[PDB]
Design a protein around this nucleic acid. Sequence first.
RNA 1: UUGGCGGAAAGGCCUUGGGUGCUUGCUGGCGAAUUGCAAUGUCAUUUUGCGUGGGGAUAAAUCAUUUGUAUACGACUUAGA
RNA 2: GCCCUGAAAAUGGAUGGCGCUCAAGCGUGUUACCUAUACUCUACCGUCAGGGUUGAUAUGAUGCCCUGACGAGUAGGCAGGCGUGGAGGUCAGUGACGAAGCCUAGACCGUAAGGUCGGGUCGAACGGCCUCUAGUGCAGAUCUUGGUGGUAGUAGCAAAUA
RNA 3: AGAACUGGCGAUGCGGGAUGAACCGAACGUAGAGUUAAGGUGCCGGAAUACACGCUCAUCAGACACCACAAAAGGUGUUAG
RNA 4: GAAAUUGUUGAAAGGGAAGGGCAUUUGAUCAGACA
Lengths: 92, 127, 183, 27, 156, 106, 197
Amino acid sequence: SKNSINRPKLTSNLHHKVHSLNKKRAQRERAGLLKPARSSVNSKSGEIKSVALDLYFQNKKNSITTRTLSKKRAKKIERNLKYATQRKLLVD
Amino acid sequence: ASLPHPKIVKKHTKKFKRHHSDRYHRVAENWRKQKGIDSVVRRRFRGNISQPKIGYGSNKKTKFLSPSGHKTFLVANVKDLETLTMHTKTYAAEIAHNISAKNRVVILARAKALGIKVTNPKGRLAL
Amino acid sequence: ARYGATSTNPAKSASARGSYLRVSFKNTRETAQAINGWELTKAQKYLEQVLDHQRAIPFRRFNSSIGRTAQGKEFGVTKARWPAKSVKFVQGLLQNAAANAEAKGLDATKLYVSHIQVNQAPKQRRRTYRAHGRINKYESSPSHIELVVTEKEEAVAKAAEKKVVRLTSRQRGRIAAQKRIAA
Amino acid sequence: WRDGRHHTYKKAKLMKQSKKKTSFTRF
Amino acid sequence: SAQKAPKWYPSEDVAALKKTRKAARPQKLRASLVPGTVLILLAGRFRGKRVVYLKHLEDNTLLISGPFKVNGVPLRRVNARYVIATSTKVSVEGVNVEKFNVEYFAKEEIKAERVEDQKVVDKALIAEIKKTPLLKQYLSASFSLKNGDKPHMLKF
Amino acid sequence: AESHRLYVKGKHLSYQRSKRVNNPNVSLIKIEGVATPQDAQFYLGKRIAYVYRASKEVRGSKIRVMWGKVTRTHGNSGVVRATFRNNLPAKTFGASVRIFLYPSNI
Amino acid sequence: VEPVVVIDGKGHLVGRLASVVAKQLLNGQKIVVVRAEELNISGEFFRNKLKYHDFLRKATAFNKTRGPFHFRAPSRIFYKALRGMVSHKTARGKAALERLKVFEGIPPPYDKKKRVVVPQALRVLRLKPGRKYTTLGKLSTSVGWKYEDVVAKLEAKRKVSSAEYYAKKRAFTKKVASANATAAESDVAKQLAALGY
RNA sequence: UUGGCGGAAAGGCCUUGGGUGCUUGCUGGCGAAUUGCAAUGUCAUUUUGCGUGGGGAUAAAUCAUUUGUAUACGACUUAGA
RNA sequence: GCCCUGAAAAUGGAUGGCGCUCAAGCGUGUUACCUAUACUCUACCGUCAGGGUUGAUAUGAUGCCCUGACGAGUAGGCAGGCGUGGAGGUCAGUGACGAAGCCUAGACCGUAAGGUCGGGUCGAACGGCCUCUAGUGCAGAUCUUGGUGGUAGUAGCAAAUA
RNA sequence: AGAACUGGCGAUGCGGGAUGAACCGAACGUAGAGUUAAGGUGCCGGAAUACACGCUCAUCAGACACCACAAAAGGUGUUAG
RNA sequence: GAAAUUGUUGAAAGGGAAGGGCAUUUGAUCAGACA
């Protein structure tokens, strides 16, 4: 600065910013909002990502509602799953 | 495994956006040659976007290979797929976007039987 | 109806809606943001105080040439107002959400406004007459208001999952050496 | 020092300035 | 028919490689690397240690030994480029390294034969280390750069 | 001992540059104790590490390293040109690098 | 080579010291400049006072509170000379300037620290004999800086204390010199002599 | 732990005594390996904190009311258990 | 030769700035060094040119192989392509196990026009190829029609005594 | 001011001259390496606060073009003739 | 049920522009493969 030339100002702000940035990032990582590692059993790398499918299996396994499954799509997934189960039934 | 190829080098990995496609929503990102007589983009001034020219043409030995090392072929049915029976190390079948799920499982069965690589096997499958 | 973004459990939550609702949208966005995330009873008390001029809604975005007040001090602002109509409409919705919460068997003392969204309804196209034989618009700016209240339930995150470590051979050997030397 | 109040006050102030990199006199 | 089959196709045969003309002539080690020389390991599990170069193996590597009794570095390979050959030498004549080769170090806890070999080579190697006044204490200490040492002028 | 160092300290000075055009693919490193271009010929080929830390504990470590090599001299004051597999970020102009003694010609 | 270099300002030329320090800062080095009031400029006193008044003419005409700010203290004159040698309007330039601290006198803790000189900016080795020169403290006092007497008083005090310190240290090095000379003929001393030590 | 000095931004410097370590000043004994030929191969403190067991501490500010030495509104200046 | 004077106003400022005085100024000599889309070498692209190729147990002869040189560009010229509505032919093409459309820091191919795939949404039609045809591609025209902003909770709602 | 010719710009980027129609350099596909041009190497700024011989001190030096103007002169400044 | 435009949520940047080019840091995210 021009009033305090002997204090670091930009460098202090950058240190404070890197501290707060990765404190926030670690807070997000501990709450698990970040996606898991590629080798994790909970990851979806190489597999299709679908909000509707995830919500359907979360409701079957039994909240977040910005991600919502419509009853239309829920019925479509149930029908598709009936087809897939019949296919596995003819397989076995 | 794939037919042997060199490293796939792309001379310009970034997409050639149109000049002011960022400034205006009405100007799309589809590339357009700047036709203005005083276009700094057309006159090729320092510090402006790069324009397509034939110098960026990819290697002929590698021009249509995906990273896996195959040229992508669009298949809609089993009959289309079987045209790659003798070309399995040079082509990988991609299933068209509109093929239904049951026809997709038929395609995957035939492809695995013939050993043809399928680009998007995960597809509409929600088993 | 489709609500806006929602990020709470539906069994322990209650919703309220008012649509095409003839109140100023800017003022309603200021008053709804004043009670976002608040406890429901505290928010109702605060709005009743806003009607009573004891406290003011802080006007944070739609605030050009708004007068300055001393009741914006507690919010860390200088510009604040008392948008009585917007606050009345939000109070009506607060009462409705509290009622919908009672009808689900929720505990009213633990209810907080987990989501409250207001946005612009179709405008009411009035016209007004100016000098020199002109016609100009005299529109309203009505509002869609929605809110979801939720029980402030106590659930704490501590000691979560650890990711598998993918050490190289040199790191494995270093760890083995460190243990073998001194635990 | 002056007293324990001033001692803890100054030690904390100097450690905060050294820990936020906001020192006129030191780095 | 999502895509028309191309009128021409590439042939499936993988082409044989050309006859490469690259003979595997043997390595030329630098003048400072002669057997019995005290080496400084610059990297690895033993960075900084002083060791004794014994034999030039067939995988272009250097067979060293700490000796193990001195500084804890056994018979192991180190790459010739990751080491500084100093001016201190010991007469390696009393050591028979015909046993050790590339296949000796293939890995596929410590094998015993490694241990008896370490003792056999090691004890013959002390006899020269104890001849010279402070070679033992030197080889048991770690090398490091101090403040102001400039490797481009340092002799070794 | 108390010194365990097997690297010569250096500083990242700037990219290779003109007055008005820089070139990130080549970086200028000032080695401590090297003051002439004929002194700097020693360090050609040596490996350079920019060792920097981070917050993610990636692959068993919270300390990250950029790897590079000394390519040639620069000027007459002992600056050397170095190239890294990933070019050094411009925020490191003034950051300490490490020039190891390997590969050796000694 | 040091972590922080505390440069004694006395007897140094403002521009040459400023250039040296600026290139040091841009290279990642932390520099402290002390005794900025005994720093030197080439040319007679009146000439540099005239150049400062020429600087002091400059001011935003419509609002003088936003013009050039004419900092009078010798640390700030040196700092201005140094800030013109750095692209201070960037983040790199700002970062480099914040590796610099400049003071009048020698305040703590640097009074207990070693002070260096930059010979390529020392007036003695640079400016030809007989050529006039300007001491920055005189210039600052002449153009407004109002703490020359204070710094002179505190510097006299610091010199008294440092003279006591040096007397003690010279006594101790007399003792150590006697000891090393009494052991200067032993076997181990001759062995170290054979090795240039 | 003894005493003294340091106010420029002292926050450091010196000193008394005991206590426990270390000592490569000198000579011995044992360990080290497999990190597999290198991969900074992590060796500080930097603090916050869920907690771990011992101490010390027990206010104010704002709004609202009021004042008019102030005031466009904020602000200012007063008064009220 | 260098230096000084050898006039010139008016906001505060300029050898580009700092600053420099046995220079960081002036004249000159010697070198070292920095650096362009230039030069040399190599790879890749395209064009042009010069050779070769009916040989079948091989496909595509406007194809393939070898070799070399080149590459700025307004008007303009030539050539090759990408895209859209409708038509003839064909894939006995795709489609309620989801057509088209729309959304998508998910992927891939192309120098590019663009093309392909994944997910969401949707709910009934639509593509590839060979051709045919044209009301065939927009950033502008104080363009046309519609919609929407900032301005802005601002100007303002103060004539006619209450 | 007229004539005659030849180059530059138009249609043209790039390096340099801080900046830029008229200056200096420069055979424009995509890159890599080296070397350079013109200009430079105190710091801004990549590059010698290089070596060497002199000159110069300017109370607003110079860094600048020059068979360019103010310019012909004035000076108890200094240097070589 | 597009865009303009807006509300909320999450992330991030901000010392008198914003945008764009080359390169890389960091954070977030993400495809592919078996001598």
